[PDB]
Amino acid sequence: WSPTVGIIMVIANVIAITFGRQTIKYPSAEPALPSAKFFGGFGAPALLATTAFGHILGVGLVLGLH
Amino acid sequence: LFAGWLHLQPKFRPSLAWFKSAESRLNHHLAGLFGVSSLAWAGHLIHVA
Amino acid sequence: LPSDPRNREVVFPAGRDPQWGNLETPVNASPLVKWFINNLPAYRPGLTPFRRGLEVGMAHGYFLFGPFAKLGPLRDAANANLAGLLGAIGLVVLFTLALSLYANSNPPTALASVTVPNPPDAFQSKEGWNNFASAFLIGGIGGAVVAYFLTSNLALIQGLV
Amino acid sequence: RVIVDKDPVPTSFEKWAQPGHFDRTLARGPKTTTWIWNLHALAHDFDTHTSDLEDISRKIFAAHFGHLAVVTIWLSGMIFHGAKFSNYEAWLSDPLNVRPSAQVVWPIVGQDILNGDVGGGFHGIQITSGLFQVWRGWGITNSFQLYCTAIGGLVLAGLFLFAGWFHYHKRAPKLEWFQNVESMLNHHLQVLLGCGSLGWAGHLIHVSAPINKLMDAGVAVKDIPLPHEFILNKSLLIDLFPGFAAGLTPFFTLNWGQYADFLTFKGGLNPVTGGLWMTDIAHHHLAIAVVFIIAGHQYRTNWGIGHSIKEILENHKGPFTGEGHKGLYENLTTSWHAQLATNLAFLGSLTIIIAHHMYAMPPYPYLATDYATQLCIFTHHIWIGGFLIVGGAAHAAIFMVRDYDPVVNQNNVLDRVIRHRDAIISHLNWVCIFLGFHSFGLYIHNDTMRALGRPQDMFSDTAIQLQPVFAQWVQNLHTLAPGGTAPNALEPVSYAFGGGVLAVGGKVAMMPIALGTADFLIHHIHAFTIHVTVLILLKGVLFARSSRLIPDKANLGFRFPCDGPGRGGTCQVSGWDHVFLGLFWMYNSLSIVIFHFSWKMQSDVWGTVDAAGNVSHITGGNFAQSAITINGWLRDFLWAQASQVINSYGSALSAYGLMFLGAHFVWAFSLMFLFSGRGYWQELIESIVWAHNKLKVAPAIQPRALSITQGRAVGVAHYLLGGIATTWAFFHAHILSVG
Amino acid sequence: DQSSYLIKFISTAPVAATIWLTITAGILIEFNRFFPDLLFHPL
Amino acid sequence: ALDARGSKLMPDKKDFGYAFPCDGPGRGGTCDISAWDSFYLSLFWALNTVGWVTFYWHWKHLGIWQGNVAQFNENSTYLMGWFRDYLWANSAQLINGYN
Amino acid sequence: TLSGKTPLFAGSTGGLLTKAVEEEKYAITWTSPKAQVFELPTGGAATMHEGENLLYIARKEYGIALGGQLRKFKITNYKIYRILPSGETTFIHPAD
Amino acid sequence: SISDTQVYIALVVALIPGLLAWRLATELYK
Amino acid sequence: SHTVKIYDTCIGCTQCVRACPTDVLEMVPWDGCKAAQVASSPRTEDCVGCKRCETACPTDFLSIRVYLGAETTRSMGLAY
Amino acid sequence: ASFLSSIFVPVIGWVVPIATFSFLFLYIERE
Ligand code: CLA
Ligand code: CLA
Ligand code: CLA
Ligand code: CLA
Ligand code: CLA
Ligand SMILES: CC1=C(/C=C/C(C)=C/C=C/C(C)=C/C=C/C=C(C)/C=C/C=C(C)/C=C/C2=C(C)CCCC2(C)C)C(C)(C)CCC1
Ligand SMILES: CC1=C(C/C=C(\C)CCC[C@H](C)CCC[C@H](C)CCCC(C)C)C(=O)c2ccccc2C1=O
Ligand code: SF4
Ligand code: SF4
Ligand code: SF4
Known part of the structure; x- marks a missing residue:
């Protein structure tokens, strides 16, 4: 029973947590098919890993807060 | 231990x-042993005590 | 819970000869275990072979009062504890035979493990094993009487303490 | 990284003509009758031919399409036989009275008496496989949905059989396609398991649970609409399941509490069917599906991110275990038996968990209502799970002989169990002996105390308690979990722990199973017969390559009879022979699990509920004071429950009377191979070849006795066949009569 | 000749003995649908 | 008895005495080849055959001693009547010796 | 004497037993071209040295089962002795 | 007061510093 | 120990010497056969009764034979 | 569970010093 309020971008923090976390933590981090150009040493699959993990780390958090 | x-x-x-x-x-x-612990105890009083 | 700390090991081999069929583990050579086993009366330095079997008989004759008196057939009757005394004394005698039967058969020499670096020198002669057998019967019977004396009146010692 | 060879093997009938083309020694032609048995033995053993792992792996992957075809032909056959030759449409109207039946028997020799009256104007064999519970659980209403499924299965059986031709004889993969185990685990965990359970979660919500809710109202069978009208006419997904008008937007605004009508957490049994709630299975397979799609994004592929298994295993090492798991990647990415040992000991152990998690939590409509079905589903997958664990132990011993390498497996955890393998076995030898006396000898104690007229000295509920404290406690935690450690549930995970009695009509669906002194003994018999089975199988794995008796056992092979009569005698030293001895203990262990089940459930669970809630069990409640003596297992279980299997002549259970005696025969027949030896029977044939030489009927292919390994293999195959089929025919004729 | 390999496959040991024992068993089955219960010759 | 002095698979069996295990895994293996081993296999049959002569003795007389000759003459032609009316039915007094 | 190096392994439970004190004990020496991984007949893997090696084994059966395993390393120089507990070393393999 | 059960949890948990105090006091030498 | 009898029918195949795992057997020169050598068993106190030597011999019937005799410690195959 | 006083207090009163003093006396008098 949590409709989208304007301040439900908790996941936008959670996504911003993730690639701020996982930039310094990947072993390879620039495989192929880059997003040219984009800040941070990412390829396109590495950045859509962090935005996918933050979109999963953020869904459990909003439901945790009911 | x-x-x-x-x-x-x-x-x-x-x-x-x-x-x-x-x-x-x-x-x-x-900052940490004196300051954060005084901050944490102020968090204990306000939330709990 | 890093020990030495990311490194190194404990199963270094027995006596630094890997071609011997034994290893040093934390059950072999942990110095609380090695101190314990070396100081049982079978292994303690400075004991007569009569003196070794005297403590071994008092210990094994002590707890064998237990399962006869509380699980035997007479355990509901008035002789519930006397049935455990005759069973415990009656089975030390069956062990006194087996010690004397082992001793008279020209018994082999005792081993030397890794937690015990020597056999205690009284366990290689027929005369040495016979003193261990004569002590076991004396201490085994006496160790079962003192278990019979304590458990037969449990309300009295607790009132007198 | 897909690279595929173009036409390696020409499709021809050339090699169908000469038999035994695969091996160079065996293709030169038969000389004795030993050649006939080695053709059928070395047939699907693709590893013995070459050293080319690329060539062997293509045969292995294509033959795996062959086994997928015969399962689909079998499965679409069971739907087709259930379409024509069944009473499925008469079973749906009254599952409390109509018995599940297929397999109408041709009437030729008087075997039309096997077509007995199951109810519904239909004569046939009362099935116990439970396919009517599955098809109702799928939501099939009429026969035409069974035809198009079965005809659809026959098409799907043809695509598997065509691709097996295609991916071997036409377009075969290279080696490095197979060793992408990071790429394999990502597709197989996500698309097969995750997307398979996500798609099936869509099948309960839109299709199955609307139909099974209309069935529980008792509306009709024909008047329930077709399940594609539930998708078209959305007004019928809103009469039932009212949390549906909000549509698709509460999924994406994270208003997942809007969906609380049809993704529930009821946690218990449906009081109408005695099965699980269909809405709980919907939220199950959906929540199952999210976890698999996430966890299948773990291993590294062509796009850089992801874990590497060669870098996961080599980090996990400690002070005790030296190099740890360093080197186990090369064992599991080169050898096929190391994969086959792992995927079979853990799928066989999974199958036993499925059997325990399906009798207490019956997942189908009217499954716990039919006692004849629920007994046989357990006892089926028990045996299927037990053969595979012995197979994982078998194909692990084959790994140690052929595929073990000292250079890779230096000082890792595989190497460190071969240094202390004497400490492993002899400490396991003690526990098997310790559990033998203190579990079975408490039955021999109770046999003698009751025979001596001393019932007060027994290990029973009355005389000397042995109450299972550590399992009576865990039942009290799982009883009190709703409201406590899992507040969102209503009843427990099952009623086997606590709760109450759920009756469906008259028969008990599930009752709280109370553990006592007899349940202490028989759960420690189980630990005894399992640790002894481990003792035999692990000794064949650790001592596969050598021992103190044979320092070069891996030089001889996995499967050799002996090393001669010397050293006292060295017969049955091989790694094959420890698989041979473990099949008996597997038979011994699993026969008591299915005897514990078949008499605890009849004495303490199953039965008929009266009006006031009094539960009248099948055997009157006699497991307590009779499952503590071996006389009681003989009197009240084997003797008393066989009064329906041997008195069944002139009735529809006549075949179970014939399979009961006919399996006592084949069991006893197997002892001729086990007890005797080969060298007797070769001498006897020499006196029969003489009478065949005299009248000029001498065969050109010389007769030989069966070899030493084969005479053991024939003697265990005929042993396990007649011993299980005795129980197969005993469980059915007892429970198709009292159920 | 691809057709000769099918005559040569139909005359191996288990394939010929499957067909011949099927014709043998089918004669005993279709004799017993029409003339059943023949315990002895009626004379 | 007759092959005790040797045969094709193993000549000169007289040089090895009466009871020897085998001659190895060679020549296909020789498990239970000795003349003692043919004593050994026969005592399974000899205990079996006297089972048959004493199951049949005992159950024909249980009809004479009880006055029911019709139970044996109907049911001893097929092997369930041996299994049911003799093994199963008579062991009810026995197994209830202690309950 | 014998004077050989001992291969690299962490010890086994196979090893030597009380017979090596009491009745007899064997020992096999071989001169290896390099250091590599072989198998012990006592059980497990080991690592030979370069030059003359030495492995105290329990029975004569072990050293000839090992010598066949050394033959696929181009090592045909292995010599088994019989070391009695009185110190009597007897050259037994080969005969010359 | 507290229940009779909870006293035994406190005794078993107290073996965890009792083991670790014996490890520290012997790592500091004899 | 056991007893290893070698008859005069073998051909000097050297398959029995290369199969006895305790190395009981050895070849001695002998002007009879084509390969001009016969198997000999000078160390039968080491024989463990394995009958690998009877399995590997070609000639029919076997030129080598192991008679199982009194079993000492070396022929029982005991490491203890 | 007030009976634990009957089993911890005599151990600390009697058994703990007897085990400690008999260890320390044999440790200080140890060549
Ligand atoms: C933020 C990080 C941090 C923190 C939390 C600590 C914390 C600590 N360090 Mg430390 N340390 C740090 C970083 C840190 N260090 C760094 C970076 C270095 C290296 C440059 C060191 C090097 C170092 C050394 C070398 C030693 C310590 C020690 C200690 C301990 C001090 C003794 C103690 O417990 O007094 C606790 C004190 C307080 C909680 C504050 C008390 C304030 C006054 C005295 C009382 C006020 C209380 C008030 C009146 C109310 C009380 C009433 C109530 C009780 C009823 C303490 C646990 C010592 C130790 O014991 O080692 C384990 C020690 O020897 N540290
Ligand atoms: C055929 C010989 C035989 C005889 C005469 C007995 C006699 C007896 N057995 Mg028994 N038993 C036998 C064989 C025999 N057993 C075998 C073969 C087994 C193995 C299956 C057992 C296993 C067995 C068990 C497990 C138990 C008995 C028990 C008993 C006693 C039951 C009466 C009672 O209440 O004890 C009352 C009397 C006593 C409790 C004590 C009597 C004094 C004892 C016997 C000896 C006293 C010292 C003796 C004089 C000198 C040393 C012993 C000597 C033999 C060297 C009785 C003495 C029960 C018992 O009490 O055992 C102790 C019991 O628990 N038996
Ligand atoms: C803190 C530990 C502690 C504890 C638990 C006790 C407990 C007791 N003391 Mg005490 N005492 C202590 C310290 C302690 N004392 C110290 C430090 C001193 C020195 C000032 C004394 C001096 C003292 C005196 C002078 C006397 C006591 C007495 C007593 C007993 C009074 C109850 C009664 O009527 O006895 C009823 C019980 C008995 C008479 C006998 C009980 C059985 C005894 C204790 C042991 C039996 C054998 C044993 C199991 C094994 C060998 C002993 C073992 C310690 C090695 C009781 C057992 C009185 C007493 O009876 O002493 C014997 C007494 O006269 N105490
Ligand atoms: C995932 C399943 C699986 C797979 C793929 C394999 C694959 C293999 N196994 Mg393995 N195995 C398995 C499960 C499996 N096994 C299980 C569960 C067991 C435990 C019983 C074993 C026990 C086992 C042993 C002990 C051995 C193998 C061997 C082999 C290899 C050759 C087998 C062969 O050619 O048989 C050819 C097929 C046959 C000989 C037919 C056997 C027919 C059986 C005995 C009767 C079936 C009864 C049937 C249900 C009832 C019929 C009734 C009748 C009236 C019609 C091959 C790599 C052998 C080997 O050397 O590996 C290299 C070997 O020695 N396996
Ligand atoms: C009923 C038949 C039977 C029995 C009793 C056993 C017994 C045993 N088998 Mg076994 N086995 C059997 C059939 C049987 N097997 C068959 C048919 C096969 C063919 C496949 C095998 C294959 C087999 C293998 C392959 C292995 C065993 C193992 C074992 C041992 C398990 C340890 C144990 O529980 O001992 C405890 C003893 C009992 C449970 C028997 C009851 C004895 C009572 C409690 C006490 C005796 C009463 C009394 C005191 C006697 C004294 C009286 C006095 C007058 C003399 C044990 C010796 C394993 C082993 O040795 O490792 C541990 C093992 O590896 N067996
Ligand atoms: C290690 C350990 C353990 C174990 C232990 C035990 C359990 C022990 C036992 C105990 C016992 C087992 C005890 C014993 C003791 C003894 C005694 C207490 C004795 C006494 C005696 C006496 C007192 C006698 C005397 C006499 C004589 C000698 C002769 C004459 C007569 C008379 C009577 C005077 C435990 C578990 C804790 C845990 C861990 C650690
Ligand atoms: C019976 C038996 C034999 C002899 C059994 C043999 C040789 C098998 C023969 C049985 C089959 C059924 C014979 C089939 C012969 C023909 C191929 C079939 C002719 C009929 C066709 C129509 C099929 C052994 O060699 C043996 C060895 C070791 C332990 C136990 C035993 C054992 O019990
Ligand atoms: S299996 Fe037969 S031939 Fe082989 S050792 Fe055993 S008894 Fe001898
Ligand atoms: S006995 Fe056999 S192996 Fe030896 S020389 Fe003669 S034929 Fe060759
Ligand atoms: S007994 Fe036989 S197998 Fe053993 S060494 Fe002698 S000849 Fe070879």
């Missing part, structure tokens, strides 16, 4: 220059 055992093992055993780094104790103990 585990921490004192751990910091006697040879690569976990601190060097001499770690002990005589006096400016770094004063920053961590004043």
